[PDB]
Design an enzyme around this catalytic site. Structure first.
Site, mmCIF file in Angstrom:
data_model
loop_
_atom_site.group_PDB
_atom_site.id
_atom_site.type_symbol
_atom_site.label_atom_id
_atom_site.label_comp_id
_atom_site.label_asym_id
_atom_site.label_seq_id
_atom_site.Cartn_x
_atom_site.Cartn_y
_atom_site.Cartn_z
ATOM 1 N N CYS A 46 4.556 6.981 -1.125
ATOM 2 C CA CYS A 46 4.740 5.892 -2.084
ATOM 3 C C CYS A 46 5.332 6.405 -3.402
ATOM 4 O O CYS A 46 5.073 7.536 -3.806
ATOM 5 C CB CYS A 46 3.379 5.202 -2.325
ATOM 6 S SG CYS A 46 3.337 3.932 -3.647
ATOM 7 N N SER A 48 4.497 5.913 -6.373
ATOM 8 C CA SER A 48 3.462 6.356 -7.317
ATOM 9 C C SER A 48 3.124 7.837 -7.163
ATOM 10 O O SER A 48 2.782 8.505 -8.139
ATOM 11 C CB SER A 48 2.201 5.526 -7.155
ATOM 12 O OG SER A 48 2.461 4.175 -7.487
ATOM 13 N N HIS A 51 5.691 9.543 -8.926
ATOM 14 C CA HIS A 51 5.545 9.378 -10.380
ATOM 15 C C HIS A 51 4.768 10.548 -10.968
ATOM 16 O O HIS A 51 5.037 10.957 -12.090
ATOM 17 C CB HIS A 51 4.807 8.085 -10.727
ATOM 18 C CG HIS A 51 5.645 6.850 -10.625
ATOM 19 N ND1 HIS A 51 7.010 6.861 -10.821
ATOM 20 C CD2 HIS A 51 5.307 5.566 -10.388
ATOM 21 C CE1 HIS A 51 7.473 5.630 -10.710
ATOM 22 N NE2 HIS A 51 6.464 4.827 -10.446
ATOM 23 N N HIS A 67 -2.313 8.507 -1.268
ATOM 24 C CA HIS A 67 -3.294 7.433 -1.387
ATOM 25 C C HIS A 67 -3.051 6.322 -0.385
ATOM 26 O O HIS A 67 -3.844 5.392 -0.276
ATOM 27 C CB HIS A 67 -3.253 6.865 -2.816
ATOM 28 C CG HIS A 67 -1.907 6.351 -3.209
ATOM 29 N ND1 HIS A 67 -0.878 7.152 -3.645
ATOM 30 C CD2 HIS A 67 -1.403 5.092 -3.173
ATOM 31 C CE1 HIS A 67 0.192 6.387 -3.844
ATOM 32 N NE2 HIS A 67 -0.083 5.129 -3.570
ATOM 33 N N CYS A 174 -1.616 0.886 0.827
ATOM 34 C CA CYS A 174 -0.990 0.675 -0.487
ATOM 35 C C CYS A 174 0.192 -0.274 -0.501
ATOM 36 O O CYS A 174 0.044 -1.442 -0.845
ATOM 37 C CB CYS A 174 -0.561 1.973 -1.184
ATOM 38 S SG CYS A 174 0.209 1.635 -2.826
#
Ligand SMILES: NC(=O)c1ccc[n+]([C@@H]2O[C@H](COP(=O)([O-])OP(=O)(O)OC[C@H]3O[C@@H](n4cnc5c(N)ncnc54)[C@H](O)[C@@H]3O)[C@@H](O)[C@H]2O)c1
Ligand SMILES: NC(=O)c1ccc[n+]([C@@H]2O[C@H](COP(=O)([O-])OP(=O)(O)OC[C@H]3O[C@@H](n4cnc5c(N)ncnc54)[C@H](O)[C@@H]3O)[C@@H](O)[C@H]2O)c1
Ligand SMILES: [Zn+2]
Ligand SMILES: [Zn+2]
Ligand SMILES: [Zn+2]
Ligand SMILES: [Zn+2]
Lengths: 374, 374
Positions: A46, A48, A51, A67, A174
């Protein structure tokens, strides 16, 4: 066997920002009371997670990211009653303790046991279960799924259908739930309405799915990478627009196409200018704009209050507003009943050991979701 | 009689900012085919009129302010069908053309025929009906009620109960409806919830009344003027707090009093710092914050998107979200059925000639609503 004992396995550790992950031998402590140790089977990549690598999302290093995943319970600690060894589960980056003010509020899901807002990089008791070459390793959003084995709190683990294809349902951890819920649960898209979706990655495409499922009349997909358009159309987009083709700001183009603005706008990128454009593109008198994207650390938007006074509704949400534990099993149930498919979202499958290649694919703009198999 | 003729009457004209209104004779043109000329009976003094005087709210000058009022129809255009000479009416600063996208939308009320967004200071046909000393005079939000006579578009005037005490129901033209609506229709305050109300003027106290009507368990009235507390309590506030009494920021005081924050916060002042305190004081995971106060011209807030991402809803509204023409008559019918009282909001009653005095009362914080009699 391995129950009650420390497990030695492999995990992708991030020791420094902007550097590749390092597959390291790590030690995973047995689960304490109300904890569950899980053998990971599949994990999605993902934005994120990326990030953190780029420094956009601050978190304590060293850390084991990941996650969005699914696995099988290896063992449980004292008091565990919701899952048992051998159960297929999906870890929840947004916990559901069920006892806090927020868990008790039917309309909210940001459980007070979360580790998103002010990252401690630990489990709920404030300690870590990972070690590597004498150094403790921080957890990520309570789940740390980029490891052959992770230990998570019981309220952050959902039991799912025993026949579930984990290599697919991991996206419910997610991406899919976040995007789908943002439309159906958070914005509460209405049939016949007009929507604008900014960002056509795995989460944005799931927003397109949510908007179509809600019966939207128009779903305008916005993305600077025209290669993302075909998939958006297949999933429900009625029009695809590239900001770079226009002399006018994208919000003005959108307003002109829609009689003053859309009823529902969604930012699914994570940039300040696109968050502003998304807000500005929904109708000033009746528009709703949902922030889904995660903005860069410590950056603020400059907003004029009048934008809201005329009648706009601005909101944001984590995990599509879904109360994690009770929702994940139902979403898997819907998937098993074929309510929706996730195949279109999985563009690449790689072994866990090629995690870096999976991130290269994300950065290249070619992939949507790369699923890692353990 | 006066039908079809120009009327020379008294009006309060504002020729310059930060200067008292000038009481003088103006010439009021007869109404066009779809217009209505009204003989004013009572006009309330709202902070928004003051925003124009202070320079906080920009509108073209010279202008005749006033927008919260009630009068009796003197004459109508030949195309008028909804009101007749002799009818008691309340001019609507937010019109209800009934034909535009917004008027068709059951959930919105910011009719596209409004003169609030970028003021022209004219009637809907782009022209003016006022002249003073030869010079044309601008209208204010299409109604300009600080005049013995005004001409308004038919879709900007509602017929109300003939037995209505105009010196009281004029508040339904702005203050009360805005405050009550902001809680019951905009925020949609729910039973047993907690609310924080920033600003206890006529509008803010009406928000308190709305929160009470909605069954809120706690209504925390906030104001730096302790003289407003008794009335807040009378109207429903469970607690009253003054920011100046605390060493820490008011949003933290409120969060500490309410387990992390209120479910609904309302800013009914019009200042940047209080809009921020109000957003910050509702729970990051389940709070909704409504902007009612009119912000100072050309000023932005600096907000971190994470304030919304955790689960907050931030929205604003004009006139309590009420579709003006259809709602005003019903709100008056409710008043006439004693469903709510307006006495407590009216602290001073002065003759129109004493408009400047009434404005000094507002500025000093000595009054809630001063109603002017013609
Ligand atoms: N709120 C949550 O709970 C939650 C959950 C998951 C992900 N996210 C966030 O959602 C966002 C999207 O995640 P993703 O995995 O789908 O990412 P992604 O990178 O796969 O998709 C981003 C898309 O945005 C497009 N884009 C980038 N800049 C653009 C611009 N200026 N204008 C228009 N389009 C542009 C990219 O081309 C790409 O198609 C990220 O910020 C992620 O951190 C939030
Ligand atoms: N949205 C709308 O349609 C609409 C309608 C009517 C009025 N308004 C706006 O609503 C706001 C309130 O109107 P009103 O007529 O009731 O005004 P008011 O002046 O009578 O009330 C403002 C209240 O806020 C208090 N206050 C001022 N600064 C404060 C501060 N820094 N901290 C705490 N309290 C403070 C004042 O003491 C007073 O009690 C104004 O901005 C007005 O322009 C908006
Ligand atoms: Zn909880
Ligand atoms: Zn994610
Ligand atoms: Zn007003
Ligand atoms: Zn209209």
């Amino acid at each position: 066997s391995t129950a009650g004992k420390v497990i030695k396995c492999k995990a992708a550790v991030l020791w420094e920002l902007k550097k590749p992950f390092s597959i390291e031998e790590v030690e995973v402590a047995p689960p304490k009371a109300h904890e569950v140790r899980i053998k990971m089977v599949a994990a999605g990549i993902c934005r994120s997670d990326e990030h953190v690598v780029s420094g956009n999302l601050v978190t304590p290093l060293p850390v084991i990211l990941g996650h969005e995943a699914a696995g099988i319970v290896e063992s449980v600690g004292e008091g565990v009653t919701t899952v048992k060894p051998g159960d297929k589960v999906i870890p929840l980056f947004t916990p559901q303790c069920g006892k806090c003010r927020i868990c008790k509020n039917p309309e909210s899901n940001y459980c007070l046991k979360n580790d998103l807002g002010n990252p401690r990089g630990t489990l709920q008791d404030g300690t870590r279960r990972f070690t590597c070459s004498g150094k403790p390793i921080h957890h990520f959003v309570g789940v740390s799924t980029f490891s052959q084995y992770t230990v998570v709190d019981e309220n952050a683990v959902a039991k799912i259908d025993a026949a579930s294809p984990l290599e697919k349902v991991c996206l419910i951890g997610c991406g899919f739930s976040t995007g789908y819920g943002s439309a159906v649960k958070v914005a509460k898209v209405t049939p016949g309405s007009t929507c604008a979706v900014f960002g056509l990655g795995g989460v944005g495409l799931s927003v397109v799915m949510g908007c179509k499922a809600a019966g939207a009349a128009r779903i305008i997909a916005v993305d600077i990478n025209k290669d993302k358009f075909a998939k958006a159309k297949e999933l429900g987009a009625t029009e695809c627009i590239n900001p770079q083709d226009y002399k006018k700001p994208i919000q003005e183009v959108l307003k002109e196409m829609t009689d003053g603005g859309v009823d529902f706008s969604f930012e699914v990128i994570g940039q300040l200018d696109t968050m502003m454009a998304s807000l500005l593109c929904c109708h000033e008198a009746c528009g709703t704009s949902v922030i889904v994207g995660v903005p860069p650390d410590s950056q603020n938007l400059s907003i004029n209050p009048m934008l809201l006074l005329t009648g706009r509704t601005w909101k944001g949400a984590i995990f599509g507003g879904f109360k994690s534990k009770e929702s994940v099993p139902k979403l898997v149930a819907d998937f098993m009943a074929k309510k929706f498919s996730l195949d279109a979202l999985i563009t690449n499958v790689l072994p866990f050991e090629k995690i870096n290649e999976g991130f290269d694919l994300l950065r290249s703009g070619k992939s949507i979701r790369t699923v890692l198999t353990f």
